[PDB]
Subunit: 136 residues, 4 copies
């Protein structure tokens, strides 16, 4: 799970220097610094005046900025769906189906211990009886 | 799962040509092209100034545009709920309950192999003994 | 699950006539009709300019409108959390743990059928042998 | 689950007095009272004109207000992810795997009652037979 929090923080970084490279020129409040894109891209990721506020005005300057905003959003929020889920799984299989996966790994092998002892007891009966067709 | 990523990308398309058909006339920044509706309908799907920014001004022109925005959002985001979930299911039944569904398909049939062998061992005891009421 | 899609569409209705009763007076674009509140309340439910756009200007007129917006949002989005989940449950217990809950209801009773037959076979051995302490 | 609804309402409070302390001075519509920050921080939590509306204009006054808004959103919405999930877990383990965890705690011990009775029956056979090598 936290192996993707690394990838997300890589995409956040990658796109932050992308937006600083492109838009630092004409949109210097939003993309002037690396740190100003690291804020704006947190804001665009949270979809708060992402398009009407940032994308639309940036796309008015460069129509090659349409894809940088769409693709950022698709990628960023998608590896959060992969991370949101990475919690539901590691949580629903931990509190619940890691404890059962073990209480049922034990309750199954606690009756191979019964069947396999009961088996021997019938063979020690097969030896006691098949030595009595040979005794009568 | 990805069998609905097709349906979503069909609704996205269907509605993009609907909005270009209707609003290209009077809302040409938003619905002028097919590709301007494919952007606007991504932004309306992301509910970022969806109503106050796009729907409200479009509904001021045509009050038949009220339903095109409500129904788009209901349908679009709903088949994402069917798709978000399509990940939780195929993921929680894959990493967890596809491996257990098989380790417990095997641990069950690994003791029909013990019971059905032990059974025979009692019948070969029933033959040894019922041949001794006939021998005494 | 769909037994709450009724309750949600009741809250949506209840609050729609509440907002038309109160704010139809001074906020007639948003709450003028029942049908204009059924739109605005879909928009406030989708948290798109819900506060800055609708609540803040409505609360400037009446500060008793603060609670109508907060409570609507808490209630509405909460019975969607109860409905979002009503899908994850009915879906994760249907495709996966309704089929297993039955394949393991059968695999369990298919060996009470083995044990309880094996039992008889030992009793018919107990009858054959306890009739041979009485025969020797 | 509701043991974190306390923590969330603590962070909501903690940050409400933080923003009233800092911004009451120059942003008195948003942070003038404790109760005006309790509204603004519900609106910032719902990410409705959170940055462009509140954060951006607050950060223009104080650039130490950048982190108060980012950290608030990260913390607040994150302990809702821990709470959203706290419902999926307590719900998916309740309606489904609390009833199965018990019907399978009983169906397992209802055959230790079969195996352990069948066991004795073979030992009473071992006694009857091992008393007949001593009788012949």
């Amino acid at each position: 799970i936290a192996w993707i929090a690394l990838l997300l923080l890589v995409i956040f970084y990658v796109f932050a220097v992308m937006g600083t490279k492109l838009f630092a020129q004409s949109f210097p409040e939003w993309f002037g610094t690396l740190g100003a894109s690291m804020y704006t891209l947190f804001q665009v990721m949270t979809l708060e005046s992402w398009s009407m506020g940032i994308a639309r005005p940036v796309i008015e300057a460069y129509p090659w900025a349409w894809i940088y905003f769409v693709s950022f959003i698709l990628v960023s929020s998608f590896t959060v769906l992969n991370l949101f889920i990475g919690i539901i799984i590691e949580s629903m299989q931990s509190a619940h189906w890691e404890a059962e996966d073990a209480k049922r790994i034990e309750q199954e092998q606690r009756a191979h211990d019964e069947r396999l002892e009961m088996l021997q007891l019938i063979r020690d009966l097969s030896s006691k009886v098949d030595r009595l067709e040979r005794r009568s």
